[PDB]
């Protein structure tokens, strides 16, 4: 019953660290570590974490090794330095996940009952794509379909702390993106707010034409999850929109009509005071 | 478990340091209080004894 | 179990402590002017969900030690001088250790038990529910066991004032103790108040009287206006008890 997780801006920096702590000699091209958290009531929080030596062979894709003794000491070391933080799960990077992630999860559920994984992106960082989290659930599948795992998605957000947010602003120092914007940042928030829109909409038809052909089998779960999108968008016809839209559009044109009136008197007064001061310095210089 | 006041700051429950012995320390006696750990370093006698020879 | 006691102390060890303060007024939607018990005055805010409408100008809150913003509000101090005036057992009696007084017992049970149980009999008749009564007479016939009887039956809240631990060396302490007493009694609505020996702070208010007795007169004038004054005393009834009902104030 996880609503959402809160990833502090510290742990992903430790992943980017440990993505570079192995890349000098390692060709593993995935980083698997241990996620520590603070399960408060219903929302999940992640403050600190660490990593663990893990490898995986591409042949037979079922062989793995976790270091339990390093997990027992270092989590026990963190408990002594901070008896607030505890285990909440694990994490791995790489978009394409290997299939030992059920085998890793079902082992370390002996540590955490509500075990959770967090997928981050180190290289796919160009578009708007945050970190990703799933959940460990065990059902059959749907009704009469064969049994499997089916990691369900839990939505994720990012939240800092008081020093963890003020220390960020001192680091950037390049554009800094001020609060409430002066008509230039706000339009770009609608520009790149829409650049991610059709990128989702191109992605829907790409999976749809993949399954309209029939290569991969269908999932009925996504069908009605897509079907309530199209028969719940509004249709603007008469007396519910076209009356009520002008009632707030002809409302907001009255107050910008003051901006036409007031700002014209502002620059006119600055014109008068300069044309007085110009001709009076001119007539008295000679 | 010595209860000691400053009468300007507070009352403190402190201990003697490991330089003196818990033999001379009685009730109503000045001590040498550490500035940070507040420990009794050296006990002070209340200006003994210019009232016997006279 | 010994491990569970250890881990509770580990969670207890990571604690800060909070600055007790009182809200003076509200400046804006997020600016509150508070003040500590001796420290300066601050301009702080609330956390996330504190229901700022409950922040009345004169409540008591608990500030953060470092952020200094409001963590949790508190009802009221209860000034431990009167803490002992509530926590005591009367006699575990049940009107069976008393006799030969049933004409006066029931008449006292009439004036007290009805407003704290049965207000419908007082709405049907155009009368205000009454205030407290008085016990006077020679020493020996009840006067303490009778209040001990009624504080065993339906003890919602109870205060027993000795009327002789209420003054001291300090000249403005006496009337301050009475005001903070009734506010505890007012807040815990269905309370009953007992005061033995009204003769100790009674007296007729007379002329020039060697200022040690002037304080008792100023103490009594505070007791007058708190009983029947500007504040509508509701759900609070007062059993007064004396031994010589001759030298009391006619205004009392």
């Amino acid at each position: 019953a996880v609503q959402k997780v809160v990833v502090h801006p510290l742990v992903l920096l430790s992943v980017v660290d440990h993505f570079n702590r192995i890349g000098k000699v390692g060709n593993q091209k995935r980083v698997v570590g241990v996620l520590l958290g603070s399960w408060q009531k219903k929302v999940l929080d992640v403050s600190n974490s660490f990593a663990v030596p893990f490898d995986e062979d591409d042949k037979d894709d079922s062989v793995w090794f976790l270091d339990h003794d390093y997990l027992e000491n270092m989590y026990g070391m963190f408990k002594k330095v901070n008896a607030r933080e505890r285990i909440v799960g694990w994490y791995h990077t790489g978009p394409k996940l290997h299939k030992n992630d059920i085998a890793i999860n079902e082992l370390m559920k002996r540590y955490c009952p509500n075990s959770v994984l967090v997928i981050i992106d180190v290289k796919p960082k160009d578009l708007g794509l945050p970190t990703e989290a799933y959940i460990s659930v065990e059902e059959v599948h749907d009704d009469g379909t064969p049994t499997s795992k089916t990691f369900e998605h839990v939505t994720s957000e990012i939240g800092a702390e008081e020093a963890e947010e003020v220390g960020v602003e001192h680091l950037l120092r390049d554009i800094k993106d001020t609060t409430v914007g002066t008509l230039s940042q706000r339009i770009t928030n609608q520009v790149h707010g829409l650049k991610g829109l059709n990128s989702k909409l191109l992605d829907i038809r790409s999976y749809l034409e993949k399954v309209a052909t029939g290569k991969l089998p269908i999932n009925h779960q996504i069908i009605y999850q897509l079907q309530d999108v199209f028969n719940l968008l509004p249709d603007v016809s008469l007396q519910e929109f076209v009356k009520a839209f002008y009632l707030k559009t002809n409302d907001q044109m009255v107050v910008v009509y003051l901006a036409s009136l007031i700002r014209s008197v502002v620059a006119l007064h600055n014109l008068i005071n300069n044309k007085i001061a110009n001709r009076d310095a001119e007539k008295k210089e000679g | 478990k010595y209860i000691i006041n400053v009468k300007q700051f507070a009352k403190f429950v402190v201990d003697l340091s490991d330089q003196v012995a818990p033999t001379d320390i009685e009730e109503g006696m000045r001590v040498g209080v550490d500035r940070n750990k507040y420990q009794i370093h050296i006990p002070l006698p209340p200006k003994i004894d210019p009232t016997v020879t006279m | 179990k010994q491990y569970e006691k250890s881990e509770n102390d580990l969670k207890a060890l990571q604690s800060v402590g909070q600055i007790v303060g009182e809200v003076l007024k509200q400046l804006t939607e997020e600016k509150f002017i508070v003040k500590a018990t001796n420290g300066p005055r601050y301009v702080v805010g609330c956390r996330r969900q504190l229901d700022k409408s409950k922040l009345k100008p004169g409540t008591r809150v608990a500030l953060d030690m470092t952020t200094l913003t409001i963590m949790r509000y508190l009802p009221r101090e209860v000034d431990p001088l009167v803490y002992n005036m509530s926590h005591e057992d009367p006699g575990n009696v049940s009107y069976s250790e008393i006799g030969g007084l049933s004409e006066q017992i029931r008449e006292l049970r009439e004036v007290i038990e009805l407003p704290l149980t049965n207000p419908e009999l007082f709405q049907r008749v155009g009368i205000i529910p009454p205030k407290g009564c008085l016990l006077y007479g020679p020493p020996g016939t009840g006067k303490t066991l009778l209040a001990r009887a009624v504080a065993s039956q339906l003890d919602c809240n109870f205060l027993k004032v000795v009327s002789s631990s209420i003054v001291d060396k300090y000249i403005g302490e006496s009337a301050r103790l009475i005001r903070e007493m009734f506010n505890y009694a007012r807040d815990h609505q269905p309370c009953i108040i007992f005061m033995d020996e009204i003769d100790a702070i009674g007296g007729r208010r007379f002329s020039e009287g060697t200022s040690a007795d002037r304080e008792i007169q100023r103490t009594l004038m505070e007791l007058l206006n708190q009983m029947d004054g500007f504040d509508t005393l509701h759900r609070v009834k007062m059993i007064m008890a004396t031994n010589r009902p001759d030298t009391l104030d006619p205004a009392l």
């Binding site: - | - | 102390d9 604690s15 800060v16 001796n38 608990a62 949790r72 631990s165 001291d168």
Partner: protein, 199 residues
């Protein structure tokens, strides 16, 4: 490992204070001897059911945690009145007043010695005995010998010592003399020259 971590983080320098009230929604308001008020969600080592308003607990200077309690403090005048451990005295030292001696042995020691001697009959022992008559005969000296043999934590009380200069001192002093008498269960109370405050 946990008890070792409690021990090292337990510093010895404390700060005495006073509990004002105790709430549950466990929580206690603490006023220190620095004239400062503090509030904590969790008390700490001691229990919420063992405290009372008016205790001199040991509080941390920085985290403000109730570490130890052990108050046992009173007024200097009340502690001056605790007079015990006298040389003994026999009842045969008083001659001629032996009936009043037997009326004391039939008054005080058997409520103390044999409580089950009364609880089967259903009666309740009294608790007030007066010595009166000519001065200098048997008033203080009889109860001196009764406290000498039957040790029951003697506590004298003088008459004019209750009369202080300032207003509202004897009501403090008498009531503090009996809060000490209530906490010491085998203790007794002896009041002398009661006519000096007896109007």
């Amino acid at each position: 490992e946990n008890s070792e971590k409690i021990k090292v983080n337990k510093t010895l320098p404390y700060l005495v204070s006073n509990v004002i009230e105790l709430l549950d929604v466990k929580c206690a308001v603490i006023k220190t001897s620095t004239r400062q008020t503090y509030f904590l969600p969790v008390i700490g080592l001691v229990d919420a059911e063992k405290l009372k308003p008016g205790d001199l607990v040991g509080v941390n200077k920085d985290s403000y945690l109730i570490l130890e309690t052990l108050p046992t403090e009173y007024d200097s005048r009340v502690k001056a009145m605790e007079v015990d451990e006298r040389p003994t005295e026999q009842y045969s030292d008083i001659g001629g007043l032996d009936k009043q001696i037997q009326e004391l042995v039939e008054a005080i020691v058997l409520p103390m010695n044999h409580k089950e001697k009364f609880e089967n009959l259903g009666i309740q022992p009294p608790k007030g005995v007066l010595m009166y008559g000519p001065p200098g005969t048997g008033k203080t000296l009889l109860a001196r010998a009764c406290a000498a043999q039957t040790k029951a934590t003697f506590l004298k009380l003088a008459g004019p010592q209750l009369v202080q200069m300032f207003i509202g001192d004897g009501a403090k002093l008498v009531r503090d003399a009996f809060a000490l008498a209530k906490e010491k269960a085998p203790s007794i109370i002896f009041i002398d020259e009661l006519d000096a405050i007896g109007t």
